[PDB]
Amino acid sequence: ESWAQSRDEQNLLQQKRIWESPLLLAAKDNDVQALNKLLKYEDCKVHQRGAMGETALHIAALYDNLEAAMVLMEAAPELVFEPMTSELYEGQTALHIAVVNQNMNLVRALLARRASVSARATGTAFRRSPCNLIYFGEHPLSFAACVNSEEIVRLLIEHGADIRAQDSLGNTVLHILILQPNKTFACQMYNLLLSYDRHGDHLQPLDLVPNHQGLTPFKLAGVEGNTVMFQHLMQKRKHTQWTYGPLTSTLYDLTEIDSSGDEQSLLELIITTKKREARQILDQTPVKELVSLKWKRYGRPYFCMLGAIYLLYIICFTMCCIYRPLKPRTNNRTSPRDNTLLQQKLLQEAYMTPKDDIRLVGELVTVIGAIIILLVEVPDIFRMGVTRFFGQTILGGPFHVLIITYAFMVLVTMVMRLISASGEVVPMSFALVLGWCNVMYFARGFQMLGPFTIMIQKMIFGDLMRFCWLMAVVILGFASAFYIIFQTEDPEELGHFYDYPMALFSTFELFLTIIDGPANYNVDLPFMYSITYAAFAIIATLLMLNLLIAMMGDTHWRVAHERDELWRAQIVATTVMLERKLPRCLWPRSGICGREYGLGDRWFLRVEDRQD
Amino acid sequence: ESWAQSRDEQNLLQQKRIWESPLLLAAKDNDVQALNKLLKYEDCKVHQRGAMGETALHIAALYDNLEAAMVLMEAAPELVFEPMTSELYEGQTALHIAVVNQNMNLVRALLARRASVSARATGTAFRRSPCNLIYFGEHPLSFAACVNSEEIVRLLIEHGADIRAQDSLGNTVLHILILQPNKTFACQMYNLLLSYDRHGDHLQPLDLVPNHQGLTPFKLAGVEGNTVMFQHLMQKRKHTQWTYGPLTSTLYDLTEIDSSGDEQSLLELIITTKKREARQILDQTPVKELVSLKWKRYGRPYFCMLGAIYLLYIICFTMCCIYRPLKPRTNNRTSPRDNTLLQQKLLQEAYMTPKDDIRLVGELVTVIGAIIILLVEVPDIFRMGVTRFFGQTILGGPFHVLIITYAFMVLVTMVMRLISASGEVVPMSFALVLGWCNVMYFARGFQMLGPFTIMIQKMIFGDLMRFCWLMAVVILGFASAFYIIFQTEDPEELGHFYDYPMALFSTFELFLTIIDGPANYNVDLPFMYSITYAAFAIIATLLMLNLLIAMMGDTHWRVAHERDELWRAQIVATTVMLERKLPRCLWPRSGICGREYGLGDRWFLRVEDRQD
Ligand SMILES: CCCCCCCC/C=C/CCCCCCCC(=O)O[C@@H](COC(=O)CCCCCCCCCCCCCCC)COP(=O)([O-])OCC[N+](C)(C)C
Ligand SMILES: CCCCCCCC/C=C/CCCCCCCC(=O)O[C@@H](COC(=O)CCCCCCCCCCCCCCC)COP(=O)([O-])OCC[N+](C)(C)C
Ligand SMILES: CCCCCCCC/C=C\CCCCCCCC(=O)O[C@@H](COC(=O)CCCCCCCCCCCCCCC)COP(=O)([O-])OCC[N+](C)(C)C
Ligand SMILES: CCCCCCCC/C=C\CCCCCCCC(=O)O[C@@H](COC(=O)CCCCCCCCCCCCCCC)COP(=O)([O-])OCC[N+](C)(C)C
Ligand SMILES: CCCCCCCC/C=C\CCCCCCCC(=O)O[C@@H](COC(=O)CCCCCCCCCCCCCCC)COP(=O)([O-])OCC[N+](C)(C)C
Ligand SMILES: CCCCCCCC/C=C\CCCCCCCC(=O)O[C@@H](COC(=O)CCCCCCCCCCCCCCC)COP(=O)([O-])OCC[N+](C)(C)C
Ligand SMILES: CC(C)CCC[C@@H](C)[C@H]1CC[C@H]2[C@@H]3CC=C4C[C@@H](OC(=O)CCC(=O)O)CC[C@]4(C)[C@H]3CC[C@]12C
Ligand SMILES: CC(C)CCC[C@@H](C)[C@H]1CC[C@H]2[C@@H]3CC=C4C[C@@H](OC(=O)CCC(=O)O)CC[C@]4(C)[C@H]3CC[C@]12C
Ligand SMILES: CC(C)CCC[C@@H](C)[C@H]1CC[C@H]2[C@@H]3CC=C4C[C@@H](OC(=O)CCC(=O)O)CC[C@]4(C)[C@H]3CC[C@]12C
Ligand SMILES: CC(C)CCC[C@@H](C)[C@H]1CC[C@H]2[C@@H]3CC=C4C[C@@H](OC(=O)CCC(=O)O)CC[C@]4(C)[C@H]3CC[C@]12C
Ligand SMILES: CC(C)CCC[C@@H](C)[C@H]1CC[C@H]2[C@@H]3CC=C4C[C@@H](OC(=O)CCC(=O)O)CC[C@]4(C)[C@H]3CC[C@]12C
Ligand SMILES: CCCc1cc(O)c2c(c1)OC(C)(C)[C@@H]1CCC(C)=C[C@@H]21
Ligand SMILES: CCCc1cc(O)c2c(c1)OC(C)(C)[C@@H]1CCC(C)=C[C@@H]21
Ligand SMILES: CCCc1cc(O)c2c(c1)OC(C)(C)[C@@H]1CCC(C)=C[C@@H]21
Ligand SMILES: CCCc1cc(O)c2c(c1)OC(C)(C)[C@@H]1CCC(C)=C[C@@H]21
Ligand SMILES: [Ca+2]
Ligand SMILES: [Cl-]
């Protein structure tokens, strides 16, 4: 807001103090004849610093003024060593600038003037941020490599440019090229810069150097969705075994893709990132064949078993709620509006007969089953990234919120049964609904409508937490009208609107056409009802056909196939969670070993494919 | 109708009187040998004027007869000075014609015959109108420039063609080129004609000369939706500050785009025009970045505050209507069809207890709030273009009609309470509905379904004020049938149709399936009912599935993305109204100044963008 406004005030102040100076102006427009006049006249202030803290040499280099920049370097050689001093462009020298503008003849000069190639452009304008349109890094080489100047990138290496130099974020130049928008020019520079990693004594060669998040360039390529570079960095891991005409048997490596157990593997990093370009990586030729093997072999069995153990558990919860304790009421009917006939038994008479002891079994089976839920779900939360990283791994798993809410209500139900509290129907009735509707989750195993509850969970897009605001306002408006219309009338005839809370429920039901329009026809209703209700039935009918449309254009001219892509992302998110929770004995590690084959101690995957 | 018919009768009469003349015919077909015979024979009527008032020279020039036209100019030189005299092609000379037909060798001659280049083609066929297929202006240069003849446009300037000459509408030649259908040939002529604005003493140079609507060529380009020329006229306003490799920092001017406060700025002229090509301008690179800054900074706050102050106001109106004065009725039940139990209290007993004084507070809060509405909305109307320009600024604001109707009903409610009038439910029940459903407007702030109440307000297209005619006819037809079928029967059994007004309401409800089909089954209904109602349920079911379709094809094969364009047009229309109503202190002017930067007294905007 104001910081963006404060950039502008400096960029204009920058152009102001150029005009308010004879030196900084002559550099901008390359008036050498009027520049020699100024440098010769007096041992002037050559350290004139404009708004961004920049000397005349920055400005000669910022506007591609080769001829001006030499004169500054001839007059006072101290200028090449001068960085900008402002908080915005801090540390930046004239060398960084000439590289970005690709001024080949100027950059050669500043190196001939022994300019530092290790100078670190720390300013805020270079850090990675959506406020900045560029992330070229922090060093001259990182700037050269991202503008695609093969010549300058070489030229800086003869002068001692450490390729292993990292940013504040730890990203060496190999990470940055993955973060650029132009992919095709970035793969060619990736190859060139490793070629200058010649010397055998390097202690974790460049493409295995992680940043301050632990990510290598390979894993960074997946998190950012750079499909081009993920492929290009993958031929280092292939090993073509044999080729028999149209057949090929490649042997992928999977050391950074498969869950080892020490650091989060690439499949965990693609699910735990907000981007949707990263989910394209799950279609690539080493990964697609691994996800479909964890699942087809060891992910559908352990998910269509724990989806049937849950069903036989909720069927036991259910029968413990149908057959609950209930006795005839002991009070008397207070008002004629009280049709309560029964109330729930106290403990001393709830468990007093054989049929109530079969139930106690099922009720202990239940509440033990709810504690278990809170011992395999809450310890994840309380130990893991309690609320930010939890829902981050969640792609289509609101399940984990509901089933913890299930187990909570079951325990509320227990306590209330122990202290003989009135109102056990309130917790149960949540637990029933939350308990069964979680069985909608144990469906994706077979490609049920679980690939299509992707929709109803994708249907927490805009027009379904947002059509509330323009439906609820209709309900509150006509319900408050309907109420005052029948506020004078006899409710034993038409009693849809006898109190304000029932006027909203009735009006909610009338919006959806799940009760019939009020009518008696043996009594004169108000004339002000039929006018009002005719409009409600119209606003309600049209708002239920702008949303059918809105749910359509957000599905057909918009996404209908990335839902099939979203399925493959839930197959992973499921597979990862099971492999994290289930023990190693039930989960054989995917891929074949290498110790008994001479390939090392890595865990390869073989893929046999036909070219054409 | 008849005026178009009267053009034709002259165009045929024009060809008639050519055939009924030996002179006008010889010109049409270029018979010089039979033309010299006619001019030499006798000092003839060379002033023969056909239907449109045209002499032989117009016709030689209208049909590209170079050889005939010279003979007329050699015989009698007085012809070049002769305009057409008819009301349709008034003022037009032979010079105007040769320019349009691009006859390069003929036009040189008429200038050699000292023909006026200031002659003003005033006729109705040249004025701007949908009845005319061309608007080439009123002068020879304006005709040359719109046919794209670089040669003739130059050639008229050596002979003294004032470029600053304006039409009856004030449009100089620079405005006209924007109004042409061919854009690409018009940008090149725009450049050429300013080049001939050399002399420094001009007193508002050409591209700052307004027409009789005050619009300059820049502002005219936006009103007309000429995206090509809006861009082309915008490089005069850019000022590229610096270029750092792929980065560019341009400094746009915004003097004619932003609301200064003296004349309506370009953002006000694009909303207040009926065209939809003009709304394309809101996506261009100086304007898109300004709308999104007024809003993101100073338009969502002042719109999500006055949208919550309104909600707490209607919640107070509501509670003042639930808790209204009501007492048991004093009369007796007239007929058994009267289930009115209560009636409303008189003033003397309406405010008699502490609970009725808390309400008086909320009722004064209310009616003060309705006067305020009528002091910030009616003074706009009564002062502004009361009914034509009001709804012109309205793009998606029927809100302004409803909220004035709200405040009116609240004051009707007041008066009726002061004079103890019966029927306060009628005004309230409008005010409730109009009051809440206006909260659907204070939603666009967050990109609610307010971008999608664009639909339901776009849904006042054809098939929703127009499907009425083919639904209402079904209702009136079967309701008048249902009525006469049960006009003989006992209504205490089936009384959906006991009077004609309830027969239309019931039938309205049955069309929409918001009440159940009539039935008793303990009594023999007419056989003529089941035949009729079976057809109604079919016509009703099919007419509710031709419109689902009609609302679809008008959304999916038709517009689904210009609604996203329509949002950005309401962001402006909202932003303009707030900036007009709210004071200057709460509204800092957008864009940075120039006085403290040497750029002048203009109000620039900086945009930093990455090329590729
Ligand atoms: C974790 C370890 C334990 C934690 C603490 C344990 C708590 C222990 C104590 C709790 C409550 C205090 C004692 C009982 C109150 C009696 C007063 C009364 O009249 O109650 C009435 C209402 O019912 C209630 O008031 C019961 C409240 C249910 C639990 C809290 C709400 C949970 C859902 C909140 C929403 C969350 C949203 C979730 C969204 C998914 C009685 O019920 P009734 O229906 O009026 O009529 C009888 C019904 N019956 C005869 C048919 C059966
Ligand atoms: C701005 C400054 C002030 C202006 C002048 C102030 C005017 C002052 C005086 C006005 C009316 C004259 C006195 C009362 C008439 C009594 C006769 C009678 O039987 O009435 C009946 C009908 O109700 C009416 O006749 C009331 C009329 C309401 C106001 C006018 C209509 C506004 C909406 C028009 C549409 C516009 C379309 C809008 C589209 C959005 C009585 O009501 P009831 O329902 O039959 O039964 C009682 C109801 N109750 C007990 C439940 C409460
Ligand atoms: C996105 C989803 C939104 C939420 C869903 C929204 C819909 C539903 C949600 C919530 C509605 C809750 C209303 C009922 C609770 C109030 C008290 C009550 O029960 O009735 C009392 C009256 O109370 C009133 O008259 C106050 C009603 C004012 C409006 C309340 C909603 C405010 C907006 C907030 C929501 C923003 C909505 C979004 C758009 C702005 C008593 O009534 P009674 O017993 O008949 O006695 C009457 C007295 N008499 C007999 C003397 C005459
Ligand atoms: C469009 C804008 C809004 C329309 C009118 C605004 C409102 C009306 C305007 C003003 C107030 C009413 C007039 C004075 C009193 C008359 C008698 C009366 O109150 O009610 C009587 C009949 O009602 C009528 O005879 C109403 C006559 C008005 C026109 C009919 C409205 C419907 C048609 C237009 C439809 C438009 C769509 C048509 C198709 C496109 C009986 O009704 P009640 O409730 O039994 O009365 C006694 C109640 N009490 C015992 C409690 C006392
Ligand atoms: C775009 C939206 C259009 C508007 C909505 C359209 C639908 C609704 C709008 C309006 C309908 C209004 C009808 C009711 C008012 C009339 C009087 C009345 O109430 O009943 C009286 C009878 O009256 C009649 O019998 C006359 C009905 C003739 C047709 C009226 C509509 C004309 C078309 C105009 C519209 C063009 C529609 C467009 C297509 C052409 C009395 O009835 P009763 O009390 O039972 O007494 C009967 C006497 N008996 C007992 C002796 C037997
Ligand atoms: C398609 C064109 C239109 C159809 C026929 C046109 C009309 C009929 C033609 C002519 C008039 C009726 C015939 C004479 C009198 C018979 C008895 C009578 O009136 O009603 C009796 C039964 O009704 C019948 O028995 C009707 C017999 C005709 C054929 C059945 C029609 C439905 C089938 C075809 C469906 C087509 C779709 C099939 C699937 C595609 C009893 O009825 P009521 O009302 O209780 O009578 C007493 C009333 N009163 C006490 C007031 C006196
Ligand atoms: C008390 C004893 C004798 C009987 C009750 C045992 C089972 C019938 C219940 C109680 C514990 C339950 C489990 C506890 C928690 C979970 C984790 C949760 O599964 C997942 O989160 C897998 C999907 C994913 O992680 O994406 C929901 C099912 C499951 C296996 C439950 C399935 C049903 C179980 C095995
Ligand atoms: C007493 C209860 C029944 C009152 C009304 C229900 C509410 C308590 C709401 C709050 C949140 C709702 C739940 C939110 C999300 C879902 C997931 C949805 O299922 C899925 O998307 C697939 C299953 C999964 O992913 O877990 C089914 C409806 C359900 C259970 C909803 C059911 C109704 C709930 C429990
Ligand atoms: C009597 C006092 C003590 C309390 C009542 C004050 C407020 C709760 C009310 C009454 C005056 C109302 C305002 C009067 C008129 C308007 C203009 C109108 O807004 C617009 O037209 C903005 C959108 C646009 O112009 O496109 C509707 C809301 C607003 C600000 C109203 C919002 C709610 C306000 C501030
Ligand atoms: C006593 C009343 C309730 C009888 C029936 C209602 C009618 C008086 C009609 C006449 C015009 C209608 C209104 C015309 C347009 C709109 C805007 C529409 O909202 C929007 O398009 C967004 C809000 C806005 O832009 O103001 C919601 C329905 C509503 C309020 C309509 C509600 C019903 C109204 C008030
Ligand atoms: C909206 C388009 C697409 C279709 C046309 C529908 C409406 C404009 C019409 C159809 C019939 C009309 C109704 C016919 C009769 C009445 C009864 C009238 O009240 C009375 O006559 C009181 C006494 C009684 O109802 O017997 C109030 C207006 C109302 C509801 C009318 C309101 C407007 C309605 C719903
Ligand atoms: C989308 C616009 C909603 C709308 C606006 C209306 O004006 C009306 C509506 C619906 O339905 C009918 C025609 C039945 C009403 C009749 C009575 C009144 C007072 C109003 C009519
Ligand atoms: C703006 C007022 C006119 C109008 C036009 C309509 O097309 C419709 C209106 C009202 O309300 C009802 C509910 C009667 C129609 C039913 C059929 C459909 C799907 C649309 C509805
Ligand atoms: C779009 C055409 C509407 C239509 C036309 C009809 O001919 C009939 C219709 C509907 O529905 C059935 C078949 C139930 C009627 C049975 C009775 C009569 C007398 C007619 C039948
Ligand atoms: C022309 C007469 C034949 C006919 C054909 C139909 O297809 C339909 C007809 C009538 O009416 C009903 C309402 C029974 C059908 C219901 C299902 C749909 C959506 C269409 C309706
Ligand atoms: Ca029903
Ligand atoms: Cl559909």
Numbering used by the authors:
A (entry chain B), B (entry chain A): 27 to 638
Please give sentences taken from the publication describing this entry.
TRPV6, a representative of the vanilloid subfamily of transient receptor potential (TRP) channels, is the principal calcium uptake channel that captures diet-delivered calcium ions in the gut4–6. TRPV6 is a constitutively open channel. TRPV6 is assembled of four subunits and contains a transmembrane domain (TMD) with the central ion channel pore and an intracellular skirt that is mostly built of ankyrin repeat domains connected to each other by three-stranded β-sheets, N-terminal helices, and C-terminal hooks. The TMD is composed of six transmembrane helices S1–S6 and a re-entrant pore loop (P-loop) between S5 and S6.
Cryo-EM micrographs for hTRPV6-CtD reconstituted in cNW30 nanodiscs in the presence of 114 µM THCV showed evenly dispersed particles with diverse angular coverage. The three-dimensional reconstruction of TRPV6THCV with four-fold rotational symmetry (C4) resulted in a cryo-EM map with the overall resolution of 2.79 Å. High-quality reconstruction of TRPV6THCV identifies three such densities per subunit as representing cholesteryl hemisuccinate (CHS), which was added during protein purification. The first one of the two corresponding THCV binding sites is formed by S5 and S6 of one subunit and S6 of the neighboring subunit and located in the portal connecting the pore and the membrane surrounding TMD. The rotation introduces a π-to-α transition in S6, making it entirely α-helical, causes a ~2 helical-turn shortening of S6, a ~2 helical-turn elongation of the TRP helix and repositions M578 so that its side chain points towards the channel pore center.
